[PDB]
Design an enzyme around this catalytic site. Structure first.
Site, PDB file in Angstrom:
ATOM      1  N   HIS A 198     -90.021 -49.173  -7.384  1.00 21.09           N
ATOM      2  CA  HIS A 198     -89.854 -48.143  -7.114  1.00 21.09           C
ATOM      3  C   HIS A 198     -90.722 -46.581  -6.565  1.00 21.09           C
ATOM      4  O   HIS A 198     -90.907 -45.945  -6.690  1.00 21.09           O
ATOM      5  CB  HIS A 198     -88.520 -47.396  -7.643  1.00 21.09           C
ATOM      6  CG  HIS A 198     -87.373 -47.895  -7.574  1.00 21.09           C
ATOM      7  ND1 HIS A 198     -86.777 -48.842  -8.890  1.00 21.09           N
ATOM      8  CD2 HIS A 198     -87.049 -48.406  -6.122  1.00 21.09           C
ATOM      9  CE1 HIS A 198     -85.119 -49.246  -8.364  1.00 21.09           C
ATOM     10  NE2 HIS A 198     -85.564 -49.677  -6.983  1.00 21.09           N
ATOM     11  N   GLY A 200     -79.331 -47.415  -4.933  1.00 15.52           N
ATOM     12  CA  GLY A 200     -79.304 -46.099  -3.900  1.00 15.52           C
ATOM     13  C   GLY A 200     -80.486 -46.108  -3.209  1.00 15.52           C
ATOM     14  O   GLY A 200     -80.733 -44.716  -2.552  1.00 15.52           O
ATOM     15  N   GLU A 201     -81.731 -46.979  -3.570  1.00 19.25           N
ATOM     16  CA  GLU A 201     -83.265 -46.513  -2.712  1.00 19.25           C
ATOM     17  C   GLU A 201     -83.460 -48.167  -2.351  1.00 19.25           C
ATOM     18  O   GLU A 201     -83.854 -47.594  -0.988  1.00 19.25           O
ATOM     19  CB  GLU A 201     -83.749 -45.988  -4.055  1.00 19.25           C
ATOM     20  CG  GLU A 201     -85.193 -45.887  -3.681  1.00 19.25           C
ATOM     21  CD  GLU A 201     -86.341 -45.547  -4.251  1.00 19.25           C
ATOM     22  OE1 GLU A 201     -87.840 -45.338  -4.323  1.00 19.25           O
ATOM     23  OE2 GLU A 201     -86.110 -44.962  -5.805  1.00 19.25           O
TER      24      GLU A 201
END
Lengths: 315, 266
Positions: free
Chosen positions: B64, B100-101
């Site tokens: 991320h 959610g990413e």
């Protein structure tokens, strides 16, 4: 363009309109991107929001007043939790009694927002978010807390030991210092009045859902926040139920007493201006309360019935 | 004001213990530092909040962190916290949850929704989401081995890094340099005395004083970085994978640096 919102505490059952408004899309239909954050240390909240590093959040009125008086320009734009009973909590057989004389020699917890305010008859401990924990553990003899939060936690311990819920006593202050308000950084409000206005619409939509259907509302909240899926949070939820503000309005009388009480004790300047506004609320203001103090005595009795009967009822 | 904000990557876990212990034992104080630890409601907010400078520092997985730079979010890893944790049939089957990413967002609740059968499987971590399933199984009679994971070991992320907003790092390199110390001291205490470490932690974070959390702690122990150093190999690989898969540009630079650590590299 995210807006940060800092809670006043770790997630609570009374934080429910804020989260619900997020999970049901209410912020989205307003074209709002909320980033809801939690503090590790409730004392960070005013300085964070005040300095501008966070746009909005929650804060008690006593602390919201002190913030302006400490150089942190913050403003209350709505009311979340109106006048919950505040006080020195203790267990029966502590041994503290109904008299304040018994508090002499004892050790008393508090969150720690303040520091130094008969200076050495009591013994102050700074417990942060763990005041009720420490009472249960006997680390402290008594401590400052809220009837619908910290007292309920004492009663959950008592219930496990088979003790009646009434063994959790409160030396009551007497208001109110502990009303939980929605707040904003002054600067953010000045530059984003439409957003704050849209924020409070979503809040109001979810508060309405909460008050109309507390049960169905809760089931969804605990699907999103499993840390609150327990009997202690559900009882706390039941006791917050009556304290929720339905209109979200700042009550002028409440602000006026505390600030005026502050001026009479020389704590606040005598030209201090109360740092709230009801201008970003988009619906009519309710009438003032007629018998303001006798509704206080009715509430205690009402909360007394909630503790025994286990239900959802407004006063 | 002069508070430095540090935004966690998740709700409080057992692996966040050095950060919290470094506060509760006065390590940040003894470095002249004022830390304000924040915790997200929604993990997805973290990169963007640090990325935009609204928050100064925090934690993020490697994958991320890399994507952040490649999304115009100027972040840089200054240290490592947890190195390489392990990330119907046992073959392919097309349901599936992600943070959610078929495609269902579960945020920090993936394992919960597996237990509740709202989802069939999920992406999670051997010491976190997996130990959760194994708790459920133990309560209804099953062996811990009934919680199975796919995706573990293949040719092809979830190392968790201390990370800074680039502008914050540039204008406060000494503060960052003193934060990593406090971390180090705390971390050494955790590694030396994991039990006595754990007790003060749960005294301060009651929401972890429970059998699930202590089992995660035990699995998390092995993945703690003792040196806090970025491991170049891992960063090279992962940025290598991205390039060779055309996801990252071929002139993309790893956004890490070990220069703010102030003790010898292993």
């Amino acid at each position: 363009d995210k807006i940060t919102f800092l809670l006043n505490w770790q997630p609570t059952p009374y934080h429910i309109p804020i989260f619900l408004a997020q999970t049901k899309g209410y912020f989205k239909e307003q074209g709002l991107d909320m980033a809801i954050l939690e503090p590790t240390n409730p004392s960070d909240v005013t300085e964070l929001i005040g300095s501008g590093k966070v746009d909005m959040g929650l804060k008690a009125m006593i602390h919201t007043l002190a913030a302006k008086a400490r150089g942190f320009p913050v403003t209350s734009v709505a009311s979340l939790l109106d006048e919950p009973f505040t006080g020195v909590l203790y267990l029966k057989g502590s041994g503290i009694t109904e008299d304040f004389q018994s508090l002499k020699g004892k050790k008393i917890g508090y969150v720690g927002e303040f520091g130094k305010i008969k200076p050495e008859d009591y013994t102050a401990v700074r417990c942060g978010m763990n005041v009720a924990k420490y009472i249960i553990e006997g680390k402290i003899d008594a401590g400052i807390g809220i009837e619908c939060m910290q007292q309920v936690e004492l009663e959950e311990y008592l219930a496990k030991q088979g003790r009646p819920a009434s063994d959790a006593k409160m030396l009551r202050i007497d208001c109110c210092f502990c009303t939980v308000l929605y707040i904003c950084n002054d600067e953010f409000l000045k530059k984003n009045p439409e957003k704050v206005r849209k924020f409070l619409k979503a809040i109001k939509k979810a508060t309405d859902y909460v008050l109309a259907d507390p049960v169905k509302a809760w089931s969804g909240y605990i699907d999103f926040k499993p840390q609150l899926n327990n009997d202690l949070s559900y009882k706390q939820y039941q006791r917050c139920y009556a304290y929720f503000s339905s209109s979200l309005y700042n009550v002028h009388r409440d602000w006026k007493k505390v600030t005026g009480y502050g001026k009479r004790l020389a704590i606040l300047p005598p030209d201090y201006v109360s740092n709230y506004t009801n201008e970003y609320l988009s619906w009519p203001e309710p009438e003032e309360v007629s018998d303001p103090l006798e509704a206080t005595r009715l509430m205690a009795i009402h909360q007394e019935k909630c503790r025994q009967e286990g239900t959802f009822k407004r006063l």
